[PDB]
């Protein structure tokens, strides 16, 4: 019809999705209300301006921001001086999503830089001279796989990498993030990711890891950092993804996990929150929404007959609307929410989430949903590694040619 | 000594007591990627840090230098490691170090390294006497700080400091009944003390949660807690629950109440309840109201629940194809 508003967030009924504080104001409700009001303005801007809304992914703007950042950053990034392989990964992945080629000058320089970050005893550090750590090790490997050249693959010292993983492994099945460091579910995921990609997984490497991870699932259905802690999207993603890599998703109560993650999508904003009663945030477009593709694959593997064959169990349209309308910086780059400043981390995760929301795949079945102008479509991303599915296949195949360290 | 923010702060390359050392510039390679244009202060401190680390100089000045390197980038785990090496080698007073870490955490509470360092100090000292109060102060500024709650769970568990936590949980729940971290803590304390098997405890818990639900019908946390503490034994195992929820329907509805009802029906259906069909239809009706009107953001999930229930509980579900 003519009166029909195609954008879900702009429909008149949508206003009914506003927070109901039951007249009991608390810090949580007050904060949530502030966000909704700010987001309501974004939604209503077209109406008050008397313009027909057109949702455009500012590709050219994002490309400039990325292209320059891959080379040089301001002192605003001093807080990430111990996370440079992450800067490499976040940027290269964003470019990959936007379907921008990586010139060999760049690829070769990234490789050489990443090898300067590699430790003499395995793993990668946050910068040259820094001790290895599982987070930048995960980032570096992903970054080299996105490049995917013989050079890129060759940078990784696999025997030392395996030695490194073992030096971090704990008796209870967990892993330290680095020597003398902290333990939480992120380490299990970082380790499984790099180990699977490089084919260095030995029979006992992940002994007890699945059980340890399963102990992190709590009464909420989600997964916390360590056993006993509140369920959170970053940890839940790490947990399920690591379990998927280890082929042990079944250790979890997938049903309660599914109900928890689906409940994390904000009825009004359309984006996802990190934990119950906290605020919406663009990066969770990946951490939270990325769980649906994983849960779909797990449930389907159990022969679940009620599974949809064209959509994920989340409102794909609403997430895309949230990202497109509220998470883009006019100058390029993406963000947490309106009012927040852009950064490469949110740029990487908002785009990753957008891609997830646009593409549904289940074997032969394929179905896209591209909100706004058709040029908004991005390249697909693998739900476990968050790098191109083709890069995953290429990397694994290449590493399967080599024997698991020690044979 | 000289704070990083002191108006009279001087670069290390301009300090006489550091004249013997040659700062080590960062090895970024001939053509850098993701190169950060560090400020002069940052680069100066780190060049000297590289120098001391490289030569493994376990000295008092190196120790003082790490404080500055940390203030410039508290996320630099390599600096924290070297500082811990220096603490042991130089035989530094750990209570003084505890004083330092509490100040740092106060200013940058959402950092992994600071909480880990404090944990190491506590372990080394085997003294948790300052923990709960310290954490309480951080939680008083951000009642949902993840690291703070995680550290609190570790302290309480490792040192068995359970006695006053439920009281603390009740206090915070009063301040903000919507605080999910506090509900999670409540579950943590009960699971590790009396447990939820004790009928008196469970009952008390459920009464309390239902009362909070009555006061703030739309607070998702209470709803999640109630489901979380009953779901394991099975929702259908508690026959009165259903009637009681149905009673809140008029003056206390929410997509939360309606969703819970579906969870009860789902379980009833799995534990061969009476009127199988009567129940299944009630459930599918709610799934439809949810997907279509009361909770459309989750339409895909609700439609799936509807298909799952249909698929396994319809009168035809057990009937052979030939019939």
């Amino acid at each position: 019809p003519v009166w029909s508003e195609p954008l879900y967030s702009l429909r008149p009924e949508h206003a009914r999705e506003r927070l109901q504080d039951d007249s009991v104001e608390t810090v949580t409700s007050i904060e949530q209300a502030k966000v909704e009001e700010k987001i309501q303005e974004v939604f209503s801007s077209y109406k008050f301006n008397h313009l027909v809304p057109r949702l455009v992914l500012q590709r050219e703007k994002h490309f400039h921001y990325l292209k320059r950042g891959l080379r040089q950053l301001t002192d605003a990034y001093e807080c990430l001086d111990a996370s440079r392989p992450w800067l490499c990964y976040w940027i290269l992945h964003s470019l990959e999503l936007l379907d921008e080629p990586i010139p060999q000058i760049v690829a070769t320089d990234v490789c050489q830089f990443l090898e300067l970050c590699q430790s003499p005893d395995g793993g990668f550090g946050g910068g040259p001279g820094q001790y290895p750590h599982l987070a930048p090790t995960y980032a570096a490997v992903n970054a080299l796989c996105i490049i995917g050249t013989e050079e890129a693959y060759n940078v990784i010292n696999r025997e030392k990498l395996l030695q490194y993983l073992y030096s971090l492994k704990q008796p209870d099945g967990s892993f330290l993030m680095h020597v003398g460091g902290e333990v939480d579910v992120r380490s299990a995921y970082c380790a499984a990711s790099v180990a699977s990609l490089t084919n260095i997984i030995t029979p006992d490497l992940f002994e007890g890891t699945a059980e340890w991870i399963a102990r992190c699932q709590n009464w909420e259905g989600g997964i916390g950092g360590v056993p006993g802690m509140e369920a959170h999207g970053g940890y839940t993603f790490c947990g399920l993804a690591a379990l998927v890599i280890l082929k042990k998703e079944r250790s979890l109560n997938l049903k309660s996990l599914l109900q928890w993650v689906t409940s994390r999508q904000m009825r009004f904003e359309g984006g996802f929150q990190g934990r119950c009663n906290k605020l919406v945030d663009g990066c969770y477009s990946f951490w939270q929404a990325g769980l649906l593709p994983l849960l779909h694959r797990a449930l389907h593997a159990q022969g679940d007959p009620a599974l949809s064959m064209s959509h994920w169990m989340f409102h794909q349209q609403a997430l895309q609307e949230y990202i497109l309308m509220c998470c883009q910086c006019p100058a390029g780059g993406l963000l947490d929410k309106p009012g927040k400043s852009r950064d490469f981390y949110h740029t990487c995760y908002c785009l990753s989430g957008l891609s997830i929301a646009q593409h549904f795949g289940s074997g032969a079945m394929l179905h896209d949903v591209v909100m706004g102008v058709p040029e908004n479509v991005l390249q697909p991303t693998h739900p476990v590694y968050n790098i191109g599915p083709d890069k995953v296949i290429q990397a694994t195949t290449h590493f399967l040619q080599k024997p698991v360290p020690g044979f | 000594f000289l704070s990083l923010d002191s108006p009279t702060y001087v670069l290390y390359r301009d300090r006489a007591e550091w004249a013997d050392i040659d700062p080590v510039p960062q090895n970024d390679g001939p053509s850098p990627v993701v190169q950060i244009i560090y400020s002069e202060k940052f680069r100066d401190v780190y060049d000297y840090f590289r120098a001391v680390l490289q030569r493994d100089e376990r000295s008092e000045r190196a120790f003082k230098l790490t404080r500055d390197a940390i203030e410039l980038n508290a996320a630099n785990y390599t600096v924290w490691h070297f500082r811990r090496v220096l603490l042991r080698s130089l035989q530094k007073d750990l209570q003084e170090e505890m004083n330092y870490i509490i100040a740092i955490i106060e200013e940058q509470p959402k950092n992994y390294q600071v909480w880990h360092h404090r944990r190491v100090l506590v372990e080394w000292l085997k003294d948790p006497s300052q923990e709960l109060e310290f954490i309480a102060d951080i939680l008083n500024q951000d009642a949902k700080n993840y690291h703070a709650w995680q550290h609190r769970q570790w302290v309480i568990q490792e040192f068995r400091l359970w006695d006053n936590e439920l009281q603390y949980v009740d206090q915070l729940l009063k301040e903000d009944v919507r605080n999910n971290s506090v509900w999670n803590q409540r579950h943590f304390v009960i699971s590790n003390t009396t447990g939820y098997s004790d009928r008196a405890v469970l009952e008390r818990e459920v009464q309390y949660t239902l009362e909070m639900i009555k006061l703030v019908p739309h607070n998702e946390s209470a709803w999640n807690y109630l489901k979380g503490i009953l779901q394991d034994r099975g929702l259908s195992r508690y026959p009165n629950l259903l009637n009681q929820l149905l009673d809140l329907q008029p003056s206390h509805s929410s997509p939360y109440l309606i969703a819970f009802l579906v969870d009860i029906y789902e379980d009833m259906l799995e534990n061969q309840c009476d009127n199988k069909e009567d129940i299944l239809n009630k459930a599918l009706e709610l799934c439809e109201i949810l997907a279509k009107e009361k909770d459309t953001i989750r339409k895909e999930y609700w439609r799936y629940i509807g298909r799952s229930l249909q698929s396994k509980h319809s009168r035809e579900s057990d009937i052979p194809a030939s019939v």
């Binding site: 807080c79 990430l80 996370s83 992450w86 750590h133 987070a135 993030m177 992120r186 970053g234 981390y345 | 996320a75 940058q108 959402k110 950092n111 992994y112």
Partner: peptide, 6 residues
Amino acid sequence: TKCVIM
């Protein structure tokens, strides 16, 4: 704050 993931 700064970066809360690591």
